[PDB]
Amino acid sequence: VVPFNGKGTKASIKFQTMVNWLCENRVFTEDKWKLVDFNQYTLLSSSHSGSFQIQSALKLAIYKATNLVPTSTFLLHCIKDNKIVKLLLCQNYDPLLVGQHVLKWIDKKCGKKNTLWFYGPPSTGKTNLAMAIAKSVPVYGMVNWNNENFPFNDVAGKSLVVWDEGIIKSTIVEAAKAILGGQPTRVDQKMRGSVAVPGVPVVITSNGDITFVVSGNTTTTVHAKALKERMVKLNFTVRCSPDMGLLTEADVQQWLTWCNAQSWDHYENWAINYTFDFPGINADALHPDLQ
Amino acid sequence: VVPFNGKGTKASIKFQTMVNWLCENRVFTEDKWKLVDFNQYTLLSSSHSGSFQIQSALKLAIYKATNLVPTSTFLLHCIKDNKIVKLLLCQNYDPLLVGQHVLKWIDKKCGKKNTLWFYGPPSTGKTNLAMAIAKSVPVYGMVNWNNENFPFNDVAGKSLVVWDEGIIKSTIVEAAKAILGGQPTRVDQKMRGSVAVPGVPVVITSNGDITFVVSGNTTTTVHAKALKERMVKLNFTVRCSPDMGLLTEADVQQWLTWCNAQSWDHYENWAINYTFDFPGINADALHPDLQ
Amino acid sequence: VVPFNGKGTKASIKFQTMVNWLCENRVFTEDKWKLVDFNQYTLLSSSHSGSFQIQSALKLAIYKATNLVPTSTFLLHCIKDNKIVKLLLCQNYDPLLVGQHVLKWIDKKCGKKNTLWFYGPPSTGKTNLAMAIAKSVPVYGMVNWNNENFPFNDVAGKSLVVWDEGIIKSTIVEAAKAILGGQPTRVDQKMRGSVAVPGVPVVITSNGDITFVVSGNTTTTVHAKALKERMVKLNFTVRCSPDMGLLTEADVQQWLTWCNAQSWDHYENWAINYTFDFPGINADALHPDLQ
Amino acid sequence: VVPFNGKGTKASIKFQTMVNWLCENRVFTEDKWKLVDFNQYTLLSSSHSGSFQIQSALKLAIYKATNLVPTSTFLLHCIKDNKIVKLLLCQNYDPLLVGQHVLKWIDKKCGKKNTLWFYGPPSTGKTNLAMAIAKSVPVYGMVNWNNENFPFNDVAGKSLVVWDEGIIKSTIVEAAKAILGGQPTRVDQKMRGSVAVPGVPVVITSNGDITFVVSGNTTTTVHAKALKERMVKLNFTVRCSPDMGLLTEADVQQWLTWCNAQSWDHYENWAINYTFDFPGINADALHPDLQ
Ligand SMILES: Nc1ncnc2c1ncn2[C@@H]1O[C@H](COP(=O)(O)OP(=O)(O)NP(=O)(O)O)[C@@H](O)[C@H]1O
Ligand SMILES: Nc1ncnc2c1ncn2[C@@H]1O[C@H](COP(=O)(O)OP(=O)(O)NP(=O)(O)O)[C@@H](O)[C@H]1O
Ligand SMILES: Nc1ncnc2c1ncn2[C@@H]1O[C@H](COP(=O)(O)OP(=O)(O)NP(=O)(O)O)[C@@H](O)[C@H]1O
Ligand SMILES: Nc1ncnc2c1ncn2[C@@H]1O[C@H](COP(=O)(O)OP(=O)(O)NP(=O)(O)O)[C@@H](O)[C@H]1O
Ligand SMILES: [Mg+2]
Ligand SMILES: [Mg+2]
Ligand SMILES: [Mg+2]
Ligand SMILES: [Mg+2]
């Protein structure tokens, strides 16, 4: 489609430049704008026009970051000292395959297996890898912030949804299957006009088996197969020492950048058959620098 | 206290004999009365007096069974062929200590540890050992039968309460802590005019860990300590042939009688300080009749 | 169990004789009692005692008919001229096998398969063959009489439940799966206090496929596997003559009496594995009497 | 069917005699009993037993009069002077045919044509003829008495239902089709336990075409065909002078008794296939008495 030949004024060009600046510097909230540039916010908020422009530019930046640019782009751009690879080696997992799977999963290139699940016993490194990952995406949401009766109230405009120490009830199990597999909600179909558009990755950490759905004062098992069809499970069964601090965006960015450079030939070999359980660590097919 | 000098008539003695028969024949409901002796039920149901007497005698027999006679008397009435012993041996547990603890627990002689917990993965023998105990006692009740919002609605007049594959919610945890610890409910305290209401033993089977209380869409571990003060845990890990069938009342009675017949020296050594987790079988402490 | 040695009076014996008379003559409602014997009803209803006795005897007779005497005895009491065998032959079915299956089904001896489904184009005999078994049993109930939101109100005390031109909605599918399989509800288990409560046979006639569950304005197939495990399906294709005539209980009694006397091996050879579709006719194995 | 062995005492026999007296003398309400025999009512109301017996006898007499005895028997108890025959001659109708049709319709022998409709212009004798036939039957009801939302709430136990100056709305048109066609409501089937327990004759008088069903603020015609099927119509197109007075029970009884013993041929052919409109006179075939 040939773009419309409409020509803008100087104010429109400056507004577009400000939107580009907002998207470039990963500023997506009013508080972040105040913390990053108080001068521009103060100058803009002196009139009605600037107040309208702030909201309009914020919305446009959200849309551009979550719809027009791949999420992995806000993930990229000597590896043995990284904390992420050491953590993934402690729990006997291959860092390269996990990184490639994360790269493919955050771009909605894994099919119906839209959910990533972390499982294991207390202090084993789970809300630390999930929340480092979440802090590197442009916008992320959480199920804990939302109301109990509406756990999926706000999923549009987000790059990731985090469910921390979560359990699935029979009241919402029908809705969760829609969001854990990537199926759009009905209202998203209605306003967009198509049958499937938005999509959103989901990451879950828990201490117990979420395949068991609580019904009343008891538990059922009839929903196990459908839930297992849509998840990839990792076992964090090795406790970690308190010698490790918080995981930061730089560590995960470096880890993913290093993973993206190496050979991908192994990954699609697994991609013929996506398994519920992630493959375990090997030694014949390990990366030479990781030894 | 010297009993009152009241003298009964022929009808009173007949009614007392009927109550004794009802209590001795282990019949406590109208349906079992019709099934066992339809002639007497039909003869009584011919007038208002007989209809009143049916309900009065049923209530009196229930009270006598659940309050005046210890439950362990009903349970009591070669051993290799017993399925209970083999099932408990396959699960790395000593049948003798388990039997002694069951005998002491059903009589409310364990203190604050009023709950028995069976934990383990699918088909390992748990709704089997529990519902043969439930049928070995005069009257038992289920949390499953009760309403969702009132799990502990009916506990008066019961010798046992069974919670099958259940989960503890945060909206009912306050009543759960009281009922699983043997603490009498406030309504019974008010109605009976005393603070010495006995309380009912509880048995729980589950696939997951019930010390993680379901709150909202997450699980909390704040109560995990307190619950551990009121429960004894048994792990059922090994699985069992699909050929062994329903376990029966005769097997439970024989196992409990044989357990009671032996010595009672090792139990009170453990009873000095009760442990949350039931100890496993010992290599040399096993009874000669079981080695 | 030795029955209670209590002895009844003359009035008790007369009441028991009246209950037996009510059972023998298949009188289970007040209107039928008035129609059959107005003299005894008028004599009894002259005082409070007789009015109480009427209801007591009716309840006892219903209970004895439903729970203490097998229903097949009420059905049991040349064959080429019978209408039922001709109707079942027109639809390419063996009347002997159908009769034996009906006899085993009405006594709750089929396990999980408690439902009988008649399906086909209109005017093919479905209501006729089903509402003749219903009139042959002592007491029968109808799903159509009950409320729309509560289709399973009166299922206790019934020998058969009839669902005519029925469709399964998504709101009642949970209770429908339980009732069609012969399992009891929580209320029945709690009131009886026996967990093992017998179910009631169900017969359904319909013009469409009832495995498609109505949800909203759509039909779904997520329950089509559990429903087929509980049902036996017969196809009524051949249209019937416009002067077929209303079927009579005597025809059903004659057909079932003839079927019960014949050999059974051709039934339990198939009864190891129950199929969703009823086996079709076989001229080689057809009984020589009705050739 | 054999009556029960039970025989009554003196009190039971006296109660049965009192019930027979109540049924014979056409006393079916307490006010009628006080008006006809105040002495017996006063002696009965001395104690609780007589008060119970009064209600029991009234209910038994009502049931006997409305279920065990044909209605026409209450109606079958020179001919020029009769007012009914003169009125029917002034309306261009054959009195013999009307009498025979009334006799066959009061006994529920007309099939689906359970309703009788009188239509015509103001003051032409219609609340007259219809309320003189209702005075002859033991017990009758009226749609006027009942609530507007539930016009057919109390129809059990009546020999006739009168709908005076009526009109059919779209809210109840489904229920009326049951009453006007003679089919039982689901409540009657539920309580009695059968499929076709009762059926009540209906008589309707109106000044307009009742086949037009009122819907909202407009009129529909989609229900006309069924109403035409379930009804028989007469045209009272001639008004009457005010000298004529009321129509009594004696006139109706004499008219119906006279029509009962003339012939049953000119009706028998018509009963082969009923027409919506009642045939008019025919001087070719008219009875010599009134000719
Ligand atoms: N805010 C923090 N600052 C420093 N170290 C932290 C912090 N949070 C967690 N850690 C460390 O990270 C490791 C695991 O913590 P965490 O990732 O929260 O565990 P987890 O498996 O998610 N726990 P749990 O929620 O109890 O099942 C431990 O070594 C902690 O000491
Ligand atoms: N109804 C039954 N009839 C015959 N045998 C049975 C029955 N139920 C259980 N069994 C036998 O008992 C074994 C244990 O079953 P069960 O006691 O139900 O296990 P469980 O651990 O409670 N199961 P689950 O509820 O899946 O955690 C089975 O493997 C069968 O061999
Ligand atoms: N009341 C009746 N009296 C006489 N014959 C009847 C009666 N009802 C049905 N039949 C006959 O029996 C046959 C079966 O009719 P019926 O059993 O009502 O049909 P059905 O299979 O339920 N049809 P439908 O409900 O339209 O799918 C027809 O050929 C009818 O003529
Ligand atoms: N209460 C009465 N007292 C005396 N005569 C009456 C009475 N009611 C009716 N009549 C006579 O019966 C005739 C018919 O009246 P009625 O039967 O009420 O007519 P209708 O056509 O049913 N009425 P409507 O359509 O409501 O105007 C009258 O013209 C009177 O002669
Ligand atoms: Mg955590
Ligand atoms: Mg179990
Ligand atoms: Mg039909
Ligand atoms: Mg009028």
Author numbering:
A (entry chain L), B (entry chain B), C (entry chain A), D (entry chain F): 202 to 278, 286 to 499
The authors write:
The main replication protein NS1 plays a critical role in cell cycle arrest, transactivation of viral and host genes, and replication and package of B19V genome. Based on its similarity to other parvoviral replication proteins, such as Rep72 of the adeno-associated virus (AAV), NS1 is predicted to contain one nuclease domain (Nuc, aa 1–176), one oligomerization domain (OD, aa 201–270), one SF3 helicase domain (SF3 HD, aa 271–501), and one zinc-binding domain (ZnD, aa 571–671). The SF3 HD domain of NS1 belongs to the SF3 helicase superfamily, which unwinds DNA with 3′→5′ polarity. Totally, four cryo-electron microscopy (cryo-EM) structures were determined, which revealed the detailed mechanisms for ATP binding and hydrolysis and DNA binding and unwinding by NS1.
To reveal how NS1_2-570 assembles, we performed cryo-EM study and solved one NS1_2-570/AMPPNP binary complex. The NS1_2-570/AMPPNP complex was determined at an overall resolution of 2.75 Å. NS1_2-570 exists as a dodecamer in the structure. The dodecamer has a height of 120 Å and it is formed by two hexamers. Each hexamer adopts a double-layered ring-shaped conformation; the top and bottom layers are formed by the OD and SF3 HD domains, respectively. Since no density was observed for the residues within the 2–201, 279–285, and 500–570 regions, they were not modeled in the final structure. In the NS1_2-570/AMPPNP complex, one AMPPNP molecule is captured at the characteristic Walker A region of each NS1 protomer. The α- and β-phosphate groups of AMPPNP form H-bond interactions with the main chains of Ser331, Lys334, and Asn336. The γ-phosphate H-bonds with the side chain of Lys334. Both β- and γ-phosphate groups coordinate with an Mg2+ cation, which is six-coordinated. In contrast, the ATP-binding pocket is widely open in the NS1_2-570/AMPPNP complex.
